[PDB]
Design a protein around this ligand. Structure first.
Ligand SMILES: *O[C@H]1[C@@H](O)[C@H](n2cnc3c(N)ncnc32)O[C@@H]1COP(=O)(O)OP(=O)(O)OP(=O)(O)OC[C@H]1O[C@@H](n2c[n+](C)c3c(=O)[nH]c(N)nc32)[C@H](O)[C@@H]1O
Ligand SMILES: Nc1ccn([C@@H]2O[C@H](COP(=O)(O)CP(=O)(O)OP(=O)(O)O)[C@@H](O)[C@H]2O)c(=O)n1
Ligand SMILES: [Mg+2]
Ligand SMILES: [Mg+2]
Lengths: 717, 726, 146
RNA sequence: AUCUAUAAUAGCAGAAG
RNA sequence: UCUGCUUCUGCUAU
RNA sequence: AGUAGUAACAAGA
């Protein structure tokens, strides 16, 4: 017998065993070299889908920009970026007509959002392009560098702390004759065009650890001048998506499954009995490369009708900046000579003035096709969205096309509705016969073509209503469990012993709750997690023979302890977990069983493995000694000048927390400097203390004198 | 003193001074998150890659004086690193755990009291049997952390800020009396606390702040049942369990209302609703406690709870609840009908409108009122509240209760009548919630009328000002018991005089979900379950017993139709339809036993529950039959498969609402000729379209044909077929 | 031109405080110059109403040590509310629903200062009604001397 | 009965597009 | 010159 | 050589 696992589908429906088809036990594919190839190929595809558009030269950056809007209607079924503005405006108008007041209410909530949001929001980002260094940096570091450069250039509206004031600072920065960068101290001066190109740049990197793809692709990260505007636009689009029944966003998880099930259920209820009902499991092809920023500007302009003009402007800036964006090419390439046995790095900035003899066929073609767009090591990319930068606005566009499917708009016997999550979509078509179904599908496809949406024909299929797939959720008369997708969440997390126990047990319990993890498999998952935990942390049961550096101390503690069942697993104790007590932490689970001296040692108030805060008297520690801190190795470049800046930053922040007790519980607000706030707090505290009677004459005088000394030092350095 | 000298030291230098001066407080958080290095990624690999090393831990240098450099085996516990940090081995952690200074004062039980409450709830819990069953889990929002019953999340956070950080609350003021009481008790309980204020704040967040999540739930949705959801509810099994602590009375009241409504609804279908209802309440538990024992000691005001109390010879209130006020009808009657209305924000929605004149005593705690109303009309409202805010509360509640078109058109803004998961919300509750935040527009669009100044009372104006001249259109201000009942075989609750006080028709049709798990013990553990469970289990019972059911469907069909097993199904059928549906199905079955060769097991199984009603004659042909699931009418199509009942001819496994019901064996007398005798009333389907007999006409167009005549009908899901009139 | 006048009319510390006050809420001192002048006048009236007033070690007010007044105006919103909350938690005085301008330790009460261009009756009445707390002091000055 | 929300600390990890 | 955006979920508290 | 797969590693300073 030849074993064929796929033959199991001959009896078990594919949905009820979909977990088999997800091979998430092996490592995911990574990229190894540069991402310049994928970046250039993305730019060339974007300009190929819009090649019949109009070419112009940007008077501000000098970049060739392609405009495919209102271009010739497509003649074939290849992806097209030729969205018609009148069709997009009609889709918006009919979405507002079908849901009266959606855009007005969304604009009110977004006005509140825009007026209250702080600049600190921008620090909630991951790796960000930093134009001051022309490199990727943490979002908070990039924002701090931007604020420092803006301040040294006389731009200080961001001192208000509001995001919109920082956006005004960005707007004013885009009008300066020259930008001063002060490194460490080399004083560089960018001119208007160079600073402008750096401000409209999105750094490009290759996406790593991605399942389901044979070939790698490029992702983009914008700078700080783009992120605030994109945040405001995405907030407006999220407010809109929240009010739409077809939107699969921003709902996620169990709430998303419930919404999808209820909406599909209502759709099947609305469909009359004599009607034929079909469902398209549909993907859209080249979604981000055919989403035009000009159509996003049209959508925002229609959505913000009759709003204050400042609001329309601040919402219009993101599509404008994305219409004039530049894509940084990346790291370049690497060249090898076998005969000379040497290798060298060729930067991307010299890919326009390099000889094409060095490259293979396809890379030479890429460079030849992309050379007219190269400026300062970036490529002009007017069309496209550059990989999920306006997820919610493109969701709104897709939902508008879905909304165009009611019988009041089709004016025929067929109609359609469905679900839209950015690019993914489930389309339910109803019609009195099969010809009507075909006509409705053709009309939906062509209407999508009219707005720059291209249904992937090779990835989409259609069947009688009742089963479909939407955003990796498989629906067979109801959504099925897919446990494999949550498989990489099982294991030792690497935080510390306590946190790893908590995470392992909690993951097992939540997988029992959400992903149909059965009780026997849950017990076996518990056993496997305890094995992996004991291996990782060298904390095998005291009464064992495994030889490790920790085993002697564990044997001593084991033989020392009367009640062994109270010892934590990290202390070589037994595993008392079962299905009953997964929701209970480990220290609480066996608190009754602990020996008194072991319990008073594990939870000692003067625990030396956790940090202690001053009130040299300190607060008592509560955590156990298993909550230690892992050494983080961060030691070979020239970027070692920031280690001292960060150390002094930390010193200042600890002093501030000594003056402001709630600063680390909630984010502090204030336009005053740190010294001013701290001195005023010290003064008012000394006053209400001398008054209430905790300090005397002389201590109050001394505090007031030190405050006056600090204030004359801040005025007189 | 220390800190001000520290600040002066940093300002004496040059770079720290420039930092302290040229950095606002808002940018301090930015410079606080400011990091330098290559960040970090995939820490699990890092942990596996550093635990084999000698010193993977970083600690403060103070540990030099607490942990020795070497143990009794010469293994190094810490090593100096070229600063205040020091690299440390896990052997140091174990050496502290076995030799460190011990104490009798640990803070862990106090800081983590909620986890010990979970421990105590598990320790004193009671385990029942495990029942393997067809499980229907529904995704809904439930409480993961219950929090304080009085406070809301916002109020709890305000209390926590006031308790832990008094001088940092800003403009905020604690308004509620519960907020002030809990703040007083927490500030009293936390003096001379040796715990850092951050950890105290997080302990209070665990104690007070309510937290919710969307989860797939079966059984009780209360937090004491959600915390053990992994243990009690599985894919195919229910583990009977009762937590150890004390139950909240609110959850008991809610679950009692749910169980009573389910029981009354299922009892109305029985031929003896009184005995059926008594059997159900005798065979029902709510959170482990017997239902009859709850009914004898629970002062819950609800129609179905009062019917349950009356059937067991108890005193009832004959009252209900609405908008926080207790309503007691003093005179009048009413029926309930579905009415579609358009709101002020252009949202169409159906409301249960009560037709008939009636009068009510509406009692709150800070207000009280006499109401008189008709079909969507507030005839009279005499409020007698204490404060003008309570007066306004009672007025708003009465305007919403009246179901006036002025009230429905006063809706402004982004008022949603659906859930975030697109689930139907109660329209009346939504209107109340909308107008309780601001009812200015409602007060303007209500109307005014002049007062005659009778009895010395004074009327109120839309500006909440007392006026002797004019008032609202029917509103007047003023300056200011369990009865023995009977019940008959059909659950009509008469008084001592003889006038009807309650009826099953007054029971709310909303199918809710219990807070505490409801346990039913009988032949069918699903008899008083939700609609999805009832449908799945009805069809599963039909096909599980298909041998005797099939033998009985031919010998004595009347005996089969009368079985109790179909009565939970019949409570989901709309009442006005039941008889008609029954008649239809029965005629189908009869014309199925007359035509030899036409035997479809799937058709019989599909239509068998609908034949459980007294059959009313009709000439209507049904293409589908409606069952009420969660406020929506799901249609079971007479021919072919549907989304509530689909038979896979390949796997032979019937699927009901996505839940497997089981396989159908091979019937030798199955009809492969293609003829159908159980689709249309008085018509045999002989196959596909024959263009000889003309174009296709409608299902409801077939009533004028004559016997011995074929035709083409567009009967089904867009399927044209050829039928003939018998 | 108003800008220039303000820049030369008031002290640099008052001007800096006004600059901070209008910069906190997104107002340009170069654009909205009348609000610049109003805020400078408010700050100057407050810093003259406060200064040269102390309480000696026995407990009464002497004009020349424990300052008689606590300046609440001209602070950041957070620092102002911190001062107000600390005063309330120490002296046990009712918390004002809005930020006041001064606090009097001797009289133990929050002072709301107003500097009106129009009649003092109108302004005063309006402010009083808005506050609706019969505990906060309201002292209204005008440029006419009333 | 409602409850991303009559809501907003932050970081990390998993999944999805 | 190298883990982006968005959404959900879980854990933790420099 | 091998890993690997559209570009890299097969040490770097
Ligand atoms: O959680 C649900 C329920 O269990 C809970 N509840 C109900 N009763 C109590 C008591 N007594 N104590 C604590 N909690 C209680 O509140 C929720 C109500 O359930 P839900 O299904 O959401 O709504 P319900 O179907 O009960 O209808 P509702 O709008 O709440 O009205 C309740 C009651 O009011 C009657 N009623 C309304 N109107 C406008 C009426 C009218 O014009 N004329 C007459 N005669 N009655 C009217 C409703 O029919 C119900 O009887
Ligand atoms: N990591 C990710 C994955 C997806 N996305 C967003 O989702 C879209 C579809 O991705 P997708 O992966 O479905 C496109 P694919 O099907 O591979 O190819 P095709 O375009 O030829 O059809 C992208 O274009 C981005 O907007 C993202 O922002 N980050
Ligand atoms: Mg798809
Ligand atoms: Mg795809």
């Amino acid at each position: 017998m030849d074993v064929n696992p796929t033959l199991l589908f001959l009896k078990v429906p594919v949905q009820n065993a979909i977990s088999t088809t997800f091979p998430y036990t092996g490592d995911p594919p990574y990229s190894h070299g540069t991402g310049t190839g994928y970046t250039m190929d993305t730019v060339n595809r974007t300009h190929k889908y819009s090649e019949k558009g109009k070419w112009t030269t940007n008077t501000e950056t000098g970049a060739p920009q392609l405009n495919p809007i209102d271009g010739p209607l497509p003649e074939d079924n290849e992806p097209s970026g030729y969205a018609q503005t009148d069709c997009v405006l009609e889709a918006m108008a009919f979405l507002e007509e079908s849901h009266p007041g959606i855009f007005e209410n969304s604009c009110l909530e977004t006005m509140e959002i825009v007026q209250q949001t702080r600049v600190d929001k921008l620090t909630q980002g991951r790796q960000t392009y930093d134009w001051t260094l022309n490199r990727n940096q943490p979002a908070a570091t990039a924002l701090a560098n931007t604020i420092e450069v803006f301040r040294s250039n006389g731009l200080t509206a961001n001192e208000s702390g509001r995001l919109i004031d920082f956006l005004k600072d960005v707007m004013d920065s885009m009008d300066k004759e020259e930008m001063e960068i002060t490194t460490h101290k080399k004083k560089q001066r960018l001119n208007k065009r160079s600073y402008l190109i750096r401000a409209l740049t999105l750094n490009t990197m290759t996406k790593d650890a991605e399942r389901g793809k044979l070939k790698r692709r490029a992702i983009a990260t914008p700078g700080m001048q783009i992120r605030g505007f994109v945040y405001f636009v995405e907030a407006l689009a999220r407010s809109i998506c929240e009010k739409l029944e077809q939107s699969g966003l921003p709902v996620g998880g169990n709430e998303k499954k419930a919404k999808l099930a209820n909406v599909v259920r209502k759709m099947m209820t609305n469909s009359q009995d004599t009607e034929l009902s079909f469902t398209i499991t549909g993907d859209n092809t080249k979604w981000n490369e055919n989403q035009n920023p000009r159509m996003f500007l049209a959508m925002i302009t229609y959505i913000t009708r009759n709003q204050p003009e400042w609001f329309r402007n601040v919402l219009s800036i993101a599509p404008i900046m994305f219409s004039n964006k530049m894509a940084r090419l990346g790291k370049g390439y690497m060249f090898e000579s076998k005969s000379m046995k040497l290798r060298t790095q060729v930067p991307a900035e010299m890919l326009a003035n390099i000889d094409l003899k060095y490259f293979n066929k396809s890379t030479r073609e890429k460079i030849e096709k992309i050379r007219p767009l190269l400026i300062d090591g970036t490529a002009s990319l007017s069309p496209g969205m550059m990989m999920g930068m306006f997820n919610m606005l493109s969701t709104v566009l897709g939902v508008s096309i879905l909304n165009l499917g009611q019988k009041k708009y089709t004016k025929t016997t067929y109609w359609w509705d469905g679900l839209q999550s950015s690019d993914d979509f489930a389309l339910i078509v109803n019609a009195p016969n099969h010809e009507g179904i075909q006509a409705g599908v053709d009309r939906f496809y062509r209407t999508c073509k009219l707005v720059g949406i291209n249904m992937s024909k090779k990835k989409s299929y259609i069947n009688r209503t009742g089963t479909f797939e939407f955003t990796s959720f498989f629906y067979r008369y109801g959504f099925v469990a897919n446990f494999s997708m949550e498989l990489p969440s099982f294991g030792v997390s690497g935080i510390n012993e306590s946190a790893d126990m908590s995470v392992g047990v909690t993951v097992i319990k939540n997988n029992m709750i959400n992903n149909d993890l059965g009780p026997a498999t849950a017990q076996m998952a518990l056993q496997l997690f305890i094995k992996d935990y004991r291996y990782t942390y060298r904390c095998h049961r005291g009464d064992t023979q495994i030889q490790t550096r920790r085993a002697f101390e564990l044997k001593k503690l084991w033989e020392q302890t009367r009640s062994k069942a109270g010892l934590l697993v990290s202390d070589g104790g037994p595993n008392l977990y079962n299905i009953r007590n997964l929701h209970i932490p480990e220290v609480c689970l066996k608190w009754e069983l602990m020996d008194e001296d072991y319990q008073g040692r594990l939870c000692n108030p003067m625990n030396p493995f956790v940090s202690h805060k001053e009130i040299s008297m300190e607060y008592d520690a509560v955590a156990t000694t298993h909550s230690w801190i892992p050494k983080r190795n961060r030691s070979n470049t020239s970027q070692r000048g920031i280690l001292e800046d960060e150390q002094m930053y930390q010193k200042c922040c600890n002093l501030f927390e000594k003056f402001f007790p709630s600063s680390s519980y909630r984010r502090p607000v204030g336009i005053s400097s740190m010294v001013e706030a701290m001195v005023s707090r010290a003064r008012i505290d000394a006053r209400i203390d001398f008054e209430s009677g905790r300090i005397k004459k002389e201590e109050f005088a001394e505090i007031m004198k030190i405050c006056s000394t600090i204030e004359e030092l801040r005025r007189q350095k | 003193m220390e800190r001000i000298k520290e600040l002066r030291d940093l300002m004496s230098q040059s770079r720290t001074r420039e930092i302290l001066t040229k950095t606002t407080v808002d940018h301090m958080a930015i410079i606080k998150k400011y990091t330098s290095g290559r960040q970090e990624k995939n820490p699990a690999l890092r942990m596996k890659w550093m635990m084999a090393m000698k010193y993977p831990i970083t600690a403060d240098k103070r540990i030099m004086e607490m942990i020795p450099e070497r143990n009794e085996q010469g293994q190094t516990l810490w090593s100096k690193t070229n600063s205040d940090r020091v690299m440390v081995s896990p052997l140091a952690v174990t050496w502290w755990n076995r030799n460190g200074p011990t104490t009798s004062t640990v803070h862990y039980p106090k800081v983590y009291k909620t986890y010990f409450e979970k421990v105590e709830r598990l320790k004193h819990g009671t385990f029942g049997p495990v029942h393997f069953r067809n499980q229907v889990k529904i995704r809904r929002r439930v409480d993961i952390n219950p929090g304080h019953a009085d406070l809301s999340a916002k109020e709890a956070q305000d209390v926590i800020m006031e308790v832990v950080f008094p001088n940092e609350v800003g403009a905020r003021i604690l308004t509620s009396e519960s907020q002030l009481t809990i703040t007083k008790e927490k500030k009293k309980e936390l003096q001379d606390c040796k715990i850092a204020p951050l950890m105290v704040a997080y302990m209070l967040e665990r104690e007070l702040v309510r937290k919710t999540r969307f989860l797939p739930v079966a059984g009780g949705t209360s937090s004491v049942y959600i915390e053990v959801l992994h243990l009690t509810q599985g894919t195919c099994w229910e583990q009977m369990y009762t937590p150890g602590g004390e139950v909240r009375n609110d959850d008991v009241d809610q679950s009692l209302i749910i169980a009573a409504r389910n029981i009354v609804r299922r009892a109305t279908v029985s031929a003896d609703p009184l005995a059926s209802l008594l059997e159900m309440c005798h065979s029902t538990q709510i959170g482990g406690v017997r239902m009859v024992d709850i009914l004898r000691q629970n002062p819950t005001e609800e129609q179905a709870v009062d019917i349950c109390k009356a059937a067991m010879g108890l005193r009832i209130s004959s009252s209900f609840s609405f908008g926080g006020f207790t309503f007691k009808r003093t005179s009048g009657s009413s029926v309930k009908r579905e009415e579609e209305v358009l709101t002020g924000n252009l949202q169409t929605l159906k409301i249960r409108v009560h037709e008939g004149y009636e009068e009510f005593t509406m009692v709150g705690r800070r207000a009280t009122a006499i109401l008189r109303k008709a079909t969507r009309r507030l005839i009279q409202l005499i409020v007698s509240g204490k404060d003008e805010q309570s007066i306004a509360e009672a007025i708003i509640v009465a305007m919403v209760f009246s179901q006036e078109d002025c009230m429905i058109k006063a809706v402004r803004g982004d008022l949603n009548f659906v859930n975030r998961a697109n689930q139907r919300l109660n329209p009346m509750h939504q209107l109340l919630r909308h107008f309780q935040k601001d009812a200015k527009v409602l007060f303007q669009n209500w109307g005014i009328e002049p007062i005659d100044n009778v009895m010395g009372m004074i009327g109120i104006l839309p500006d909440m000002t007392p006026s002797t001249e004019m008032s609202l259109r029917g509103v007047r201000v003023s300056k200011m018991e369990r009865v023995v009942v009977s019940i008959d075989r059909f659950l009509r609750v008469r008084d001592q005089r003889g006038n009807v006080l309650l009826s099953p028709e007054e029971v709310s049709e909303t199918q809710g979900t219990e807070k505490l798990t409801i346990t039913y013990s009988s032949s069918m553990m699903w008899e008083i379950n939700g609609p999805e469970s009832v449908l799945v289990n009805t069809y599963q019972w039909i096909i599980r017993n298909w041998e005797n059911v099939k033998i009985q469907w031919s010998q004595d069909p009347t005996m089969l139709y009368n079985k109790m097993e179909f009565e939970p199904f019949q409570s989901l059928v709309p009442k006005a339809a039941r008889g008609q549906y029954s008649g239809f199905v029965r005629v189908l079955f009869q014309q199925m036993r007359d035509v030899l060769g036409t035997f479809d097991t799937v058709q019989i199984i599909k239509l068998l529950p609908f034949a459980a009603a007294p059959p009313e004659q009709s000439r209507m042909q049904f293409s589908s039959l409606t069952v009420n699931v969660r406020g929506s009418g799901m249609r079971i199509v007479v021919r072919g498969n549907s989304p509530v009942f689909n038979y896979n001819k390949a796997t032979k496994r019937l699927t009901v609402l996505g839940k497997d019901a089981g396989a159908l064996m091979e019937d030798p007398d199955e009809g492969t000729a293609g003829v159908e005798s159980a689709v249309l009333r008085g018509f045999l389907i002989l196959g596909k379209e024959n263009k000889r007999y003309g174009p296709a006409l409608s299902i409801n167009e077939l009533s004028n044909l004559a016997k011995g005549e074929k035709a083409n009908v567009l009967i089904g899901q867009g399927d044209v077929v050829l039928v003939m009139k018998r | 031109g108003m800008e220039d006048f303000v820049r030369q009319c008031f002290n640099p510390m008052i001007v800096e405080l006004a600059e901070k006050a209008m910069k906190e809420y997104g107002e340009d001192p170069k654009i909205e110059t009348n609000k610049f002048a109003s805020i400078c006048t408010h700050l100057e009236v407050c810093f003259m109403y406060s200064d040269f007033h102390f309480i000696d070690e026995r407990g009464e007010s002497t004009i020349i040590l424990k300052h008689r007044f606590e300046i609440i105006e001209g602070r950041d919103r957070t620092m102002a509310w911190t001062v107000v909350n600390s005063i309330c938690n120490t002296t046990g005085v009712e918390k004002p629903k809005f930020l006041p301008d001064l606090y009097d330790y001797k009289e133990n009460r929050f002072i709301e200062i107003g500097v009106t261009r129009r009649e003092v009756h109108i302004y005063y009445l309006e402010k009083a009604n808005k506050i609706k707390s019969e505990k906060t002091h309201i002292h209204i000055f005008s440029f006419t001397g009333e």
